[PDB]
Subunit: 443 residues, 4 copies
């Protein structure tokens, strides 16, 4: 049961030599990753049911075509593939076969350890994805949120979305469900009411995530950054403003990434508004969160972030006001509106981190350390926990090597565990499906 | 002199180019008795997205027309604040406001200000049909050469969530096939198809969704527009608003509705049975979720009784398969194109559709008029449904429209008479409509109608 | 040999009754005008300028209006073969063709009291709005240009360069839809639009049914408007223009320059902002000297406040206009006026009232210096239209056949100074395109 | 103002910082003289005498965080309107930046680019064309490449304006060598045509090369300037982008192109290709074409009159033909799975892709003999015309033919004899040099 999809959105003008490299990489051991990311995309609107599915790349003189063998029928309306899903499909080929292949094959001097190279790559990737619009006045609000979230948390984030869209702002989330879908959903409705024509709804994700988490159907720009170290850096550089909702260990982990970069002294003059918000009930959640930050980083971290409870209008209003300040801030520095080139991200924050049980129990989670190293290695630990929850390698590794164990001191490790268990009690650790098994053991 | 909230809105969408003498027309008509109407229509528009209860909270509101040499501007005094963002009027409400200005003070204003010699009135079905065209062209709803995608959806204002989601789902399939929606500019079944169609449009990167809302002054004064509408049109008569529905449409889908939705159907079915329209293609398809099976079965029995079992060659009833409902309309789009190509008719306005003058003639819901409705099978099915349409439109007057909402206790509640089995098959439907809350949204409902 | 033209640009959406109306209007005696205006449109340039002579070759032509349910179409019977590319009517001509259906059969046919100066003006707005010429929310860029239907190649070159400069400053041009001066600026402005990547060129040709039937549209025009009177065509020219560049011309260009100056010198329009520049190519020195020498003491001495003369600086001329734009935009905000239409300009009913030459009417011309500056220019405009009527306008040509040259009355050295102007027009070969000699329909003194 | 800072327009709009760096290194390298001279030329669209009239001119690359700007020291006063660079000049300027410093720099200093493989040289030409956003995707064929002399009389210049008009009347675009005479009048005529048919979005490409551009500024009609590295690859891009060629009356070069074409057309694997070649002239041209036809038939084969067609003084027919052929290409493309914008399928033989160093030793080893296969013939026939063209404008070749000896070539005498009659006629046609100063042969 075979369908020949032509390119939409991406990979339209391919050279004949590139077409050959795409076909090679698609026969390589990368196949399954390119398969699954491609089956996920075809299944936005929620893997093991579609074991018949297989996607073959097809060489034509002009460019490439994708062949869909036993694809999921709901991605087709009267025969034709839904345009959005078709384009996400080709975005996966772009950022899986094209991107992730090319960075290993070859490229003369791609250090991949020079934090310069690393940032220029994240620029390149966004550029190839046609996501850095030239002469674009700043409108993008990177939203961060938890994937399992309450109907009230959802209804609240939809309202924040709607107010953002009523102020002609665009959204960039994790390409996923719950809080990454609901701001897009709400913004769309505002855009409409204000006759906004061209909505951008970027979804920023990574290969391991997108294999088990389809995009939400709202995304119209799908970027698969290779590692969360890049995905996170990409979040920061493209955004002109961040709103961190109630999330789990992922959303938590992103916060430390921000705060690691924002506290740096080099970025004392950079302009990137951070606003943690939530509904009236989230107030307790933020309490703990905030105290946890104060204690790990200082009262000096509260200067970079602001908490608004149960005022979505103001939350949007604040960002719509900030946008003229992100514009001027980039104008003075001679920076790009698209890409926050000037922001100083620390090699300790860009360096890929492999979440091995060893690495997690040698984390420098001690107060005798600079705040940078603390939040950096904090984040490192928050990524392993995201590992044992969703990423395939982690969910298996915890059930075969045993939970992650963590070092540190108490009050530090003490308070965090109060976060972690608190997260579970809110069920933001795992989808409502079944229950949750801690992949972590904190003293 | 007291504390007031002032804003000035510049024309968006309509009334952008205005000669100076026209500007004088509008200002005069806005001092005319038409003010109160104009005011409450513009109030209803502002209150899109939030029943007279809302309108008795904005009694401080007043809308004043401003002259400038170039054209016009609209002054909002104590406007509802929920219609502004950071002090700026939401663009959509801004255009709908200037739609109201067009269709109430320009359109309906020039009409209200014409002679009505009842000795020699222009009952000409050509006027009513060229007029209906002229109204749509002024509201820029008639796009040259745009191929047929408009699907006119009908349904009750008060419907149950199961219906609402179904109309929503039907909407989704409709838009997933790059099809536009036209409705009654209202809540319930009149917004839920747009809501779902919207999502389909997105998934397919369908730019320029047209969600036209055909209403009428009475309805819109009391019922603000539903938020999904982008082209708002305020046709003067339910008689002309109906006819507009029919001509612009390239497909019709009737959901489960109360009196209004019923009355439109008879109006439609009447134009479909007319012989000159045996070669005209316009797909009519009633749909609803599973629970509406019964409703429609009754519905059918009423129609076949009033029209014959030959009615059923003009519609098709689909239950719980919104995908197919859209699939079919989508399939029928090419037919309507060629049907218009052959005859040389226009995509936008069905000029060849013969609509009968007794279907185009307005029916004042006088209680005397109402019982004089010849509801007898000896008459052509044409005249049977014409009067049957007219009866169904009276009940809606008693329920929503001002004249007859209160004109009913004064001059008395409505009473219809004719063939008894006809009146009987009506009561099951009407009294069924009461049990489905398709008459009124409910907390309270008065019959406003009486049959032996 | 028949071909079927569907509507392009205008008369796209039409109600069945309207189509019905156009059908009858086409069967009326207007047919000749409607077919005559249609024939010029279909000839435009095509490397032939013969006034009426070229058109005599197409005596078999005929255009019938067709009625379809959707709208209207146009039937071309024996149409000039040069208006077709491999069978397809060239789109510009097709649009200009359909503009004649709009403005001859729809507009002109249907002609509200037309002596009320208010109704007149709002009629002129309604004609322009119909041709979608008053665009909404457009910063001012329109420089109306006036000139001569006949001009040596010297002036043509200059006005291309003026037009090139003008275009190079993202300025659109508007003329009288004719040749020579009414084409050159567009020809260059277009070039200039290219270099500065200005995509939406707007080259408006505004004309009357009297002129279009004998002077076809130059092919540069992409917005054609056929206003009914020269009186209404002029009124339009003024309202839509945000600047005006007068080149050298004959008696027609002359007719405008008094029209305009009359309106500007009126007191109510002292605060209005409309930059008037006269430019010529160096050799125009004397022509502009004798023109200025004429105006100074025929009309007011103070009238040199309302025009600036520039010779052989095409750059500066366009620069000045490109600076004037923001002032005109400010002048409209302050008045709360529109950019597209200058409503506030007080145009006198004496400048709105059509003029029929005859001969008594030329005798009853109050050309006296005692007369107000205004009254003087109103009838001074009229005098020139006489010479423009019997020059080319068929009604006037026949009228100078029977009763001969118009007897221009007036008085004062005013008459002698008209004569040495008029003598120059003919002596400079700006009164008739080269082909025969010229027969003065004017008898001064 | 004597200094002005021009922003990127049309190219080089989105640049990564590592890129912005490499550009300045290349501006600091000896390439500057080329980049200066091409940028002077671009700015003088409105003869190498004007090069010595602007000696103080100098153009510098400004680095910014966002991207690059261009610093213009003492530019020709004619390029600015009220101080603002003419939008079109500005974009030509940045195409010089794109194609001299980015393209020309990067390929010479690399090496995984073999540049000796005909698969490489071909995909490079695709690449540069894509990079200059000139290969439009999903564009129905309309691109009519027009070849012809730079020194052509007023009858030919006017005729090509007519064949240009007629092409525009029929909504066809034009591509030439960014030059005067025949390379301008078509575009001049074509654009009137596009006006008359309300054709918006005209395309007027100009393929040229660094040695050419620096002494011959682009004509003012060109809106896409493309500067391919050499004449060998310039021609390849000519061919491959074009859906139809018209060869006007030209000299050497217009000579050199035709043998290039014919070499590729007569080659067997290209007998199924669809690319009309109409050689047209204005009636007095009959004699020049006569001599031309007699020449090829002998020098190649009477089997060559299959690939070209001669029309004289029928501009409307020349256009009429090409418009009919525009659909025929589409099928020829759609069948093979080829791209409408690039003619991937055509087999250009490597002998025609390999740059020919116009040296005297090399000019001797030109197999100019009728025993060789018509393919081999052509290739070396072309190489010979690259030699003479060098003698005329190319710096390398004007220097080599100065005191170091005019270019000398021989072979079969009938062949040689045909040549001297042609070349002699070119001199007599003043197609070899523009001005009336008598021309001195390099042959
Ligand atoms: N600074 C900045 N400019 C950008 C960016 N993306 C596009 N641009 C535009 O590039 C233009 C460059 O103008 P400048 O800021 O004065 O130049 P700079 O780069 O800062 O250094 P320079 O002084 O030349 O040496 C701006 O036009 P204007 O500001 O003059 O007018 P407007 O925004 O209204 O359109 C911007 O609109 C960006 O990320 N940062
Ligand atoms: N008659 C009519 N035509 C419409 C309508 N909407 C779009 N069109 C188009 O306008 C074009 C005019 O077609 P005609 O040549 O005039 O049809 P004819 O029957 O031959 O003569 P007639 O209309 O009676 O005067 C149509 O065909 P095309 O040129 O596009 O090609 P195509 O027709 O192949 O689809 C349609 O595409 C409409 O409501 N009515
Ligand atoms: N004068 C004029 N204005 C128009 C026209 N069409 C829209 N407008 C808008 O009207 C604005 C005038 O400014 P306002 O202070 O708000 O006055 P208005 O309410 O519009 O009328 P009012 O003058 O008070 O009677 C301009 O915005 P700006 O703030 O940018 O002012 P600008 O472009 O002039 O620099 C225009 O954008 C028009 O045809 N003429
Ligand atoms: N060959 C070609 N196709 C292009 C190009 N750009 C887009 N396309 C489109 O890609 C479609 C390919 O359809 P396919 O089913 O795959 O059939 P083929 O063309 O034979 O290629 P295939 O062998 O399957 O790989 C074409 O549809 P149609 O063939 O029906 O043509 P159109 O719609 O434009 O009128 C084109 O519309 C291009 O540069 N070249
Ligand atoms: O917070 P979780 O939902 O538990 O983990 C994934 C998140 O990590 C990132 O910040 C994205 O916003 C994701 O939403
Ligand atoms: O309650 P109902 O009157 O039945 O619902 C309102 C509908 O009746 C009218 O015809 C309009 O089409 C509306 O869609
Ligand atoms: O009659 P001419 O003076 O020779 O030229 C025609 C002029 O008369 C009209 O007003 C046009 O705008 C032209 O300026
Ligand atoms: O001026 P000529 O030297 O005679 O001709 C040179 C041609 O060869 C090149 O392809 C260019 O496009 C030119 O058209």
């Amino acid at each position: 049961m075979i369908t020949h999809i032509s390119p939409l959105g991406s990979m339209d003008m391919l050279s004949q030599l590139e077409v050959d490299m795409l076909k090679r990489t698609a026969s390589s051991d990368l196949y399954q990753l390119f398969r699954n990311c491609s089956l996920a995309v075809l299944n936005s609107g929620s893997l093991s049911r579609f074991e018949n599915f297989d996607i073959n790349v097809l060489r034509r003189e002009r460019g490439v075509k994708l062949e869909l063998i036993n694809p999921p029928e709901e991605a087709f309306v009267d025969g034709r593939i839904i345009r959005a899903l078709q384009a996400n499909l080709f975005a996966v080929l772009r950022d899986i076969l094209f991107v992730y292949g090319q960075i290993h094959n070859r490229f003369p001097n791609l250090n991949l350890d020079n934090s310069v190279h690393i940032t220029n790559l994240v620029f390149s990737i966004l550029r190839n994805a046609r996501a850095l619009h030239v002469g674009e006045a700043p409108n993008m609000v990177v939203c961060w949120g938890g994937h399992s979230i309450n109907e009230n948390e959802y209804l609240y984030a939809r309202r924040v979305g709607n107010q953002l869209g009523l102020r002609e702002l665009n959204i960039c989330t994790g390409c996923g469900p719950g809080a990454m879908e609901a701001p897009m959903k709400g913004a769309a409705v505002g855009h409409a009411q204000q006759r906004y024509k061209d909505s951008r709804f970027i979804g920023m994700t990574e290969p391991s995530i997108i294999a088990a988490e389809p995009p939400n159907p709202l995304v119209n720009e799908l970027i698969i950054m290779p590692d969360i170290e890049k995905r996170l850096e990409a979040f920061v550089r493209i955004a002109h403003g961040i709103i961190i909702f109630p999330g789990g260990v992922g959303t938590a982990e992103a916060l430390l990434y921000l705060l690691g970069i924002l506290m740096n002294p080099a970025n004392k003059d950079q302009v990137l508004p951070l606003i943690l918000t939530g509904p009236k009930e989230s107030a307790d959640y933020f309490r703990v969160l905030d105290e946890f930050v104060v204690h790990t980083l200082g009262e000096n971290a509260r200067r970079h972030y602001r908490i608004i409870i149960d005022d979505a209008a103001e939350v949007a209003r604040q960002m719509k006001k900030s946008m003229p300040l992100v514009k001027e801030n980039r104008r003075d520095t001679g920076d790009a509106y698209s890409f926050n080139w000037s922001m100083r991200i620390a090699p300790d924050l860009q360096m890929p981190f492999e979440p091995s049980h060893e690495n997690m129990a040698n984390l420098k989670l001690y107060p005798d350390q600079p705040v940078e190293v603390l939040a950096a290695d904090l984040r490192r630990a928050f990524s392993g926990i995201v590992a044992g929850n969703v990423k395939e390698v982690g969910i298996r590794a915890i059930e075969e090597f045993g939970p992650y164990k963590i070092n540190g001191d108490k009050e530090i490790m003490r308070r965090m565990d109060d976060l972690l268990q608190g997260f579970v009690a809110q069920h933001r650790m795992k989808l409502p499906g079944s229950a949750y098994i801690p992949c972590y053991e904190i003293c």
